[PDB]
Design an enzyme around this catalytic site. Structure first.
Site, mmCIF file in Angstrom:
data_model
loop_
_atom_site.group_PDB
_atom_site.id
_atom_site.type_symbol
_atom_site.label_atom_id
_atom_site.label_comp_id
_atom_site.label_asym_id
_atom_site.label_seq_id
_atom_site.Cartn_x
_atom_site.Cartn_y
_atom_site.Cartn_z
ATOM 1 N N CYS A 211 100.575 5.967 -15.333
ATOM 2 C CA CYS A 211 100.143 7.254 -15.828
ATOM 3 C C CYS A 211 98.821 7.858 -15.339
ATOM 4 C CB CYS A 211 100.132 7.202 -17.337
ATOM 5 S SG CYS A 211 99.456 8.695 -17.958
ATOM 6 N N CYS B 108 112.010 14.921 -9.942
ATOM 7 C CA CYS B 108 113.448 14.662 -9.998
ATOM 8 C C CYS B 108 113.994 15.237 -11.308
ATOM 9 C CB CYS B 108 113.706 13.154 -9.935
ATOM 10 S SG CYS B 108 115.429 12.668 -10.157
ATOM 11 N N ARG C 57 116.425 14.715 -16.728
ATOM 12 C CA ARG C 57 115.438 15.394 -17.554
ATOM 13 C C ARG C 57 115.960 15.892 -18.904
ATOM 14 N NH1 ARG C 57 113.521 20.884 -18.176
ATOM 15 N NH2 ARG C 57 115.479 21.343 -17.061
ATOM 16 N N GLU D 40 103.106 3.953 -20.751
ATOM 17 C CA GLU D 40 102.251 3.243 -19.804
ATOM 18 C C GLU D 40 102.543 1.751 -19.932
ATOM 19 O OE1 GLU D 40 98.011 4.122 -19.442
ATOM 20 O OE2 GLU D 40 98.351 6.044 -20.431
ATOM 21 N N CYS E 3 97.692 6.625 -24.436
ATOM 22 C CA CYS E 3 96.884 7.769 -24.021
ATOM 23 C C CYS E 3 97.192 8.972 -24.910
ATOM 24 C CB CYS E 3 97.130 8.106 -22.547
ATOM 25 S SG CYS E 3 98.429 9.288 -22.244
ATOM 26 N N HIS E 4 96.296 9.954 -24.911
ATOM 27 C CA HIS E 4 96.446 11.129 -25.761
ATOM 28 C C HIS E 4 97.809 11.794 -25.838
ATOM 29 C CE1 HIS E 4 92.087 10.727 -25.945
ATOM 30 N NE2 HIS E 4 92.158 11.459 -27.044
ATOM 31 N N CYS F 244 118.907 14.285 -5.595
ATOM 32 C CA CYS F 244 118.898 15.668 -6.055
ATOM 33 C C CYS F 244 118.073 16.563 -5.125
ATOM 34 C CB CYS F 244 118.346 15.758 -7.477
ATOM 35 S SG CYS F 244 116.577 15.506 -7.578
HETATM 36 N N1 LIG Z 1 99.484 16.234 -15.207
HETATM 37 C C1 LIG Z 1 99.815 14.984 -15.531
HETATM 38 O O1 LIG Z 1 100.810 14.485 -14.960
HETATM 39 C C2 LIG Z 1 99.086 14.300 -16.442
HETATM 40 C C3 LIG Z 1 99.139 12.952 -16.481
HETATM 41 C C4 LIG Z 1 98.428 12.251 -17.369
HETATM 42 C C5 LIG Z 1 97.632 12.972 -18.253
HETATM 43 N N2 LIG Z 1 97.582 14.307 -18.208
HETATM 44 C C6 LIG Z 1 96.669 15.093 -19.071
HETATM 45 O O2 LIG Z 1 95.345 14.896 -18.614
HETATM 46 C C7 LIG Z 1 94.417 15.254 -19.655
HETATM 47 C C8 LIG Z 1 93.381 14.142 -19.849
HETATM 48 O O3 LIG Z 1 93.924 12.800 -20.038
HETATM 49 P P1 LIG Z 1 92.894 11.626 -20.479
HETATM 50 O O4 LIG Z 1 93.614 10.339 -20.658
HETATM 51 O O5 LIG Z 1 91.852 11.504 -19.423
HETATM 52 O O6 LIG Z 1 92.286 12.164 -21.861
HETATM 53 P P2 LIG Z 1 90.803 11.919 -22.399
HETATM 54 O O7 LIG Z 1 90.679 12.408 -23.789
HETATM 55 O O8 LIG Z 1 90.464 10.479 -22.331
HETATM 56 O O9 LIG Z 1 89.833 12.709 -21.456
HETATM 57 C C9 LIG Z 1 89.445 14.057 -21.868
HETATM 58 C C10 LIG Z 1 87.955 14.201 -21.575
HETATM 59 O O10 LIG Z 1 87.630 15.592 -21.553
HETATM 60 C C11 LIG Z 1 86.424 15.768 -22.250
HETATM 61 N N3 LIG Z 1 86.371 17.137 -22.704
HETATM 62 C C12 LIG Z 1 86.899 17.713 -23.856
HETATM 63 N N4 LIG Z 1 86.603 19.071 -23.971
HETATM 64 C C13 LIG Z 1 85.868 19.307 -22.834
HETATM 65 C C14 LIG Z 1 85.244 20.471 -22.454
HETATM 66 N N5 LIG Z 1 85.317 21.600 -23.189
HETATM 67 N N6 LIG Z 1 84.484 20.442 -21.286
HETATM 68 C C15 LIG Z 1 84.367 19.268 -20.539
HETATM 69 N N7 LIG Z 1 84.997 18.087 -20.926
HETATM 70 C C16 LIG Z 1 85.733 18.179 -22.089
HETATM 71 C C17 LIG Z 1 86.665 14.792 -23.407
HETATM 72 O O11 LIG Z 1 85.428 14.562 -24.098
HETATM 73 C C18 LIG Z 1 87.111 13.505 -22.662
HETATM 74 O O12 LIG Z 1 85.977 12.884 -22.043
HETATM 75 C C19 LIG Z 1 95.270 15.437 -20.925
HETATM 76 O O13 LIG Z 1 95.682 16.803 -21.013
HETATM 77 C C20 LIG Z 1 96.476 14.572 -20.504
HETATM 78 O O14 LIG Z 1 97.616 14.928 -21.295
HETATM 79 C C21 LIG Z 1 98.310 14.969 -17.305
HETATM 80 C C1 LIG Z 2 100.558 10.559 -19.906
HETATM 81 C C2 LIG Z 2 100.810 12.007 -20.188
HETATM 82 C C3 LIG Z 2 101.307 12.753 -19.000
HETATM 83 C C4 LIG Z 2 102.392 13.741 -19.342
HETATM 84 C C5 LIG Z 2 103.017 14.325 -18.088
HETATM 85 C C6 LIG Z 2 102.891 15.843 -17.960
HETATM 86 C C7 LIG Z 2 103.813 16.415 -16.866
HETATM 87 C C8 LIG Z 2 104.952 17.345 -17.353
HETATM 88 C C9 LIG Z 2 106.017 17.640 -16.275
HETATM 89 C C10 LIG Z 2 107.454 17.411 -16.749
HETATM 90 C C11 LIG Z 2 108.405 16.914 -15.647
HETATM 91 C C12 LIG Z 2 109.695 17.752 -15.430
HETATM 92 O O1 LIG Z 2 109.929 18.835 -16.206
HETATM 93 O O2 LIG Z 2 110.591 17.416 -14.460
HETATM 94 ZN ZN LIG Z 3 116.187 13.213 -8.114
HETATM 95 ZN ZN LIG Z 4 99.396 8.191 -20.381
#
Ligand SMILES: NC(=O)c1ccc[n+]([C@@H]2O[C@H](COP(=O)([O-])OP(=O)(O)OC[C@H]3O[C@@H](n4cnc5c(N)ncnc54)[C@H](O)[C@@H]3O)[C@@H](O)[C@H]2O)c1
Ligand SMILES: CCCCCCCCCCCC(=O)O
Ligand SMILES: [Zn+2]
Ligand SMILES: [Zn+2]
Ligand SMILES: NC(=O)c1ccc[n+]([C@@H]2O[C@H](COP(=O)([O-])OP(=O)(O)OC[C@H]3O[C@@H](n4cnc5c(N)ncnc54)[C@H](O)[C@@H]3O)[C@@H](O)[C@H]2O)c1
Ligand SMILES: CCCCCCCCCCCC(=O)O
Ligand SMILES: [K+]
Ligand SMILES: [K+]
Ligand SMILES: [Zn+2]
Ligand SMILES: [Zn+2]
Lengths: 373, 373
Positions: free
Chosen positions: B173, B110, B114, B67, B44-45, B99
Site C-alpha cells: 500500500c 485492471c 472491480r 496491507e 492505514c487510514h 483487459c
Molecule cells: N492514491 C493511492 O493509491 C493511495 C494509496 C494509499 C493511500 N492513499 C491516501 O494517501 C493519504 C495519506 O495516507 P497516510 O497513510 O500517509 O495517512 P497519514 O495520516 O499517516 O498522513 C497524513 C499526514 O498529513 C498531515 N496533514 C493533515 N492535514 C494537513 C494539512 N492541512 N497540511 C499539511 N499536512 C497535513 C497529517 O498530520 C499526517 O502527517 C490518504 O488520503 C490515503 O487514503 C492513497
Molecule cells: C490504502 C488506501 C489506498 C486506497 C486506494 C485509492 C485508489 C482508488 C482507485 C480505485 C481503483 C479502480 O476504480 O479501478
Molecule cells: Zn486487467
Molecule cells: Zn493502506
C-alpha cells in the site's frame, strides 16, 4: 534617419465602444525595437474581450490587434538579425532566448518583457503611439490594428518572403495555438481517439493537428451545427451538438467511445465545458487540454477521483510554440501544404470596415476575418 | 482436498465500533481463487475511514485490512502459477493482464473484478467468510485482518521467499504508492525541485522516491512538526508548517523557490491543500500529483489560468504500478537495499491488540503499525 510616421490606426478610445479610424503618430524605433508596416490583420475573441471592458487588465486608449503580418519598415539601434524589408509576424509571446523560460524546453512563456507588455508599453516603459495629443497604449506587445506598429525585437518572427501575408497573419495566433495544442501539449499518438469542444478557428486548428498526428477518431463538439461542415472538412470523423442530448456531454462521449476519449481539448473558454472535457477523458490515461481562456474569476472544478483514477488536466499558451524559432517553421509547413491556413479565412474586409469583423465574430458566422490594411 | 478453515479474524460488525476478535469459517478456494495464510498485516487510514462509517460504499459486516503478506495455503481449480507454500502479497489493485487496461502501458487500473470487489465479494459474486451464522464481506479484495483469507487469483503477487513478511506487508500500500507517485506518475528528472504535502507513510515514500530520482530540493509540508525529523531522515531538505505563516502555503513555496516547485505531491486528501499543491507549482512546467483520497462529494478547484500558463494536474493509484508484475520487483529493490521498508514501521502489535493500531493512528503518532498474526 528614422522619422516620426503619420498614419491611420484603429483606436479603441474607451471600453464598450467600437474602434475609431484615427490619424496617429508612430515614433521611430528606439534601441532593440522594430517598426513594422502591417499588411494584414485578423480579429480574435481576445481583442473583443479587452474592448468590452470585461478584462480587468484592459487599459485605454489603446491600439488592439495581435494577429498580423507585415514588412519591417526600420529597426532600432543594436538590431542586427532584422532589417528593413524583412517579412515578419508580430508575436504576443516573445522569445528572448536568455531567460529562465526560454532556456527550458518544457515552456514557451518568455518573461523578459511581460511587465511592460502588460502595461501596454515598450520594454523601456514608454509608448510609441500618440493621437490628438494623447498617449495611446500598445496591446499584447503587437498592436496590429495600425498601418505601422512598433514591437520589441524579441517579439518578431522572420518568415518566408513568399508567404501571402493576408493569410499567414492567422499564424500569429489561432491556427498556431490549436495546432500546437495537439502536437506539442498533448503529443497524441497515431490512432488516438480525440474530442474537440468548440469548432471555431482554434478548434479547427486542433482537429487539423489531430489529423496530422494520425488520430483514428476526431469528435467535434459545438452547440452551433453550422460549424459541423467545415469541422469535417478539416478532419472531424463526426460532430455532435450537446443540445441534442438530455444527459451531460461527458456521458455522451464516454458512451460513444467505450470509456472516454484519449485526448480532449476545450477551445471555448467555458469552465463548465472544461470540466466536461476532462470527465469525457478515458479512465486511466485520458488527457484533457484547456485551450480556451475563461473570464477572470471563473474557476474549473471536478472531483479528485477523476485524477486519481488516471486522467490528466493540462493547458496551453500559443500551442506551446517557442514563438521566434517556431513561427517561421509553421509558415514553411503552410507553404509545403503540410498544414492549412487559407481554409480558416471566411471573410475579407478593408481597414475602414474593421468593426464589421467584430460584428461577424459576435454573429457567430465567421471563423476568421482578414482585414487588409 | 481443501476443507473449510476455522480461524481467528477481526470482524467489523458495524460502523463506529472497535473490531471484534471472532472465530470464523473460511471456505476453500473456488475456480481461480487463492486462500492465503496471513503472517502480517498493517493498518492505514483507509481501513479506519470505512470503519468510521463515513464511507458511502462501506457495507457491514466486513473483514477489513489491505496491507498484508503471507503464504499460499491452497489454490482453486485452474490455478497453475501459484501453489501452496508460495510467498505472496494480496493486491487491492489486480492485474488480469488481458483487459483493455492491463494491456495499456499508461495505466495499472485492471477492471476485470472491480464490480464484485467493490461489493465485498469474490468474482463469482459470493463471500468465503461466515461467522456466528452470518456472511461477512471481503474488503478491497484482500481482507488481511484474518489468519486466512481468500482472494481472486489475479490479486496476488508472488514474491521472494526470503523477504521478511512483517516488513514487506507495507509494500501492499503506502510505500509502493508514494514511491510510484514519484517515479511512475511524476517521472521527475534529476535535480527537480519537489514539495510533499503530508508526511505520513505515503509522503515519506514520495520523498524516498524523489531521492532515488535525484531530486535536488525536497520540501516537506505538514501541520504536525513531529513528522519532520523522520521526513528529513528520508531525504527532505527542509520542512515547513503551514501554520507558521500568515500567507497561503502556495505563496510561501513560490517565494522559497523563485517561482514554485517542479513537482508537488498531495498526500493528505484535503481538496483545499490539493489546490495549494497545484498553485505551488512553477509556471510553465510545474506538475502536481494528487495522491490523497478526498472525502466523497468534495471537489478540487483552481482558475483555468493555472493550466493555461503551464501547470499540469495529475493523480495516481497505487503509484501506477501494474501490481502483479511490479510488487515482486519492489520487494527485490528492498532486498537489494535500493528502497526502505523497515523505517516505515513505528509500532508492532499482536493480533488481539489490533484495535490499538487505530488508536495510534488517531493520536497522529504513527506511520505504520504492523500487526503480527
Ligand atoms: N492514491 C493511492 O493509491 C493511495 C494509496 C494509499 C493511500 N492513499 C491516501 O494517501 C493519504 C495519506 O495516507 P497516510 O497513510 O500517509 O495517512 P497519514 O495520516 O499517516 O498522513 C497524513 C499526514 O498529513 C498531515 N496533514 C493533515 N492535514 C494537513 C494539512 N492541512 N497540511 C499539511 N499536512 C497535513 C497529517 O498530520 C499526517 O502527517 C490518504 O488520503 C490515503 O487514503 C492513497
Ligand atoms: C490504502 C488506501 C489506498 C486506497 C486506494 C485509492 C485508489 C482508488 C482507485 C480505485 C481503483 C479502480 O476504480 O479501478
Ligand atoms: Zn486487467
Ligand atoms: Zn493502506
Ligand atoms: N490558449 C491560447 O493560447 C489561446 C489562443 C487563442 C485563443 N484562445 C481561446 O480559444 C477559445 C476559442 O477561440 P476561437 O477563435 O476559436 O473562438 P470562437 O468563438 O470562434 O469559437 C468558439 C466556439 O465555441 C462554440 N461553443 C460555445 N459554447 C459552446 C458549448 N457550450 N459547447 C460546445 N461548443 C460551444 C461556439 O459556437 C464557437 O463556435 C477562446 O476562448 C479564445 O480566447 C486561447
Ligand atoms: C488570441 C488569444 C491570446 C490569449 C493568450 C493566452 C496565453 C496566456 C499566457 C500569458 C501569461 C504569461 O505570458 O505569463
Ligand atoms: K502523449
Ligand atoms: K516528467
Ligand atoms: Zn487571437
Ligand atoms: Zn525569454
Amino acid at each position: 534617419a528614422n522619422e516620426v510616421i503619420k498614419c491611420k490606426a484603429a483606436v479603441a478610445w474607451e471600453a464598450g465602444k467600437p474602434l475609431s479610424i484615427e490619424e496617429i503618430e508612430v515614433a521611430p524605433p528606439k534601441a532593440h525595437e522594430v517598426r513594422i508596416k502591417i499588411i494584414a490583420t485578423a480579429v480574435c475573441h481576445t481583442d473583443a474581450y479587452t474592448l468590452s471592458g470585461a478584462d480587468p487588465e484592459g487599459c485605454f486608449p489603446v491600439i488592439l490587434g495581435h494577429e498580423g503580418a507585415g514588412i519591417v519598415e526600420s529597426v532600432g539601434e543594436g538590431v542586427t538579425k532584422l532589417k528593413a524589408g524583412d517579412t515578419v509576424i508580430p508575436l504576443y509571446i516573445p522569445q528572448c532566448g536568455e531567460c529562465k523560460f526560454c532556456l527550458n524546453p518544457k515552456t514557451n512563456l518568455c518573461q523578459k518583457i511581460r511587465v511592460t507588455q502588460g502595461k501596454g508599453l515598450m520594454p523601456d516603459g514608454t509608448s510609441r503611439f500618440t493621437c490628438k495629443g494623447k498617449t495611446i497604449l500598445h496591446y499584447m506587445g503587437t498592436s496590429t490594428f495600425s498601418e505601422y506598429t512598433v514591437v520589441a525585437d524579441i517579439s518578431v518572427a522572420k518568415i518566408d518572403p513568399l508567404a501571402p501575408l493576408d493569410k499567414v497573419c492567422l499564424l500569429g495566433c489561432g491556427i498556431s495555438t490549436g495546432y500546437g495544442a495537439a502536437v506539442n501539449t498533448a503529443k497524441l499518438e497515431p490512432g488516438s481517439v480525440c474530442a474537440v469542444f468548440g469548432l471555431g478557428g482554434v478548434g479547427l486548428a486542433v482537429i487539423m493537428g489531430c489529423k496530422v498526428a494520425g488520430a483514428s477518431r476526431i469528435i467535434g463538439v459545438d452547440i452551433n451545427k453550422d460549424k459541423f461542415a467545415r469541422a469535417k472538412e478539416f478532419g472531424a470523423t463526426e460532430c455532435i451538438n450537446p443540445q441534442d442530448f438530455s444527459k451531460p456531454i461527458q456521458e455522451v462521449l464516454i458512451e460513444m467511445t467505450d470509456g472516454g476519449v484519449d485526448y480532449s481539448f476545450e477551445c471555448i473558454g467555458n469552465v463548465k465545458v472544461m470540466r466536461a472535457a476532462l470527465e469525457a477523458c478515458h479512465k486511466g490515461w485520458g488527457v484533457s487540454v484547456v485551450v480556451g481562456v475563461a473570464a477572470s474569476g471563473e474557476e474549473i472544478a471536478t472531483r479528485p477521483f477523476q485524477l486519481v483514477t488516471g486522467r490528466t488536466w493540462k493547458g496551453t499558451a500559443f500551442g506551446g510554440w517557442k514563438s521566434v524559432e517556431s513561427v517561421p517553421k509553421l509558415v514553411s509547413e503552410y507553404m509545403s501544404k503540410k498544414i492549412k491556413v487559407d481554409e480558416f479565412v471566411t471573410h475579407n474586409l478593408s481597414f475602414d470596415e474593421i468593426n464589421k469583423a467584430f460584428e461577424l465574430m459576435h454573429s457567430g458566422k465567421s471563423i476568421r476575418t482578414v482585414v487588409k490594411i
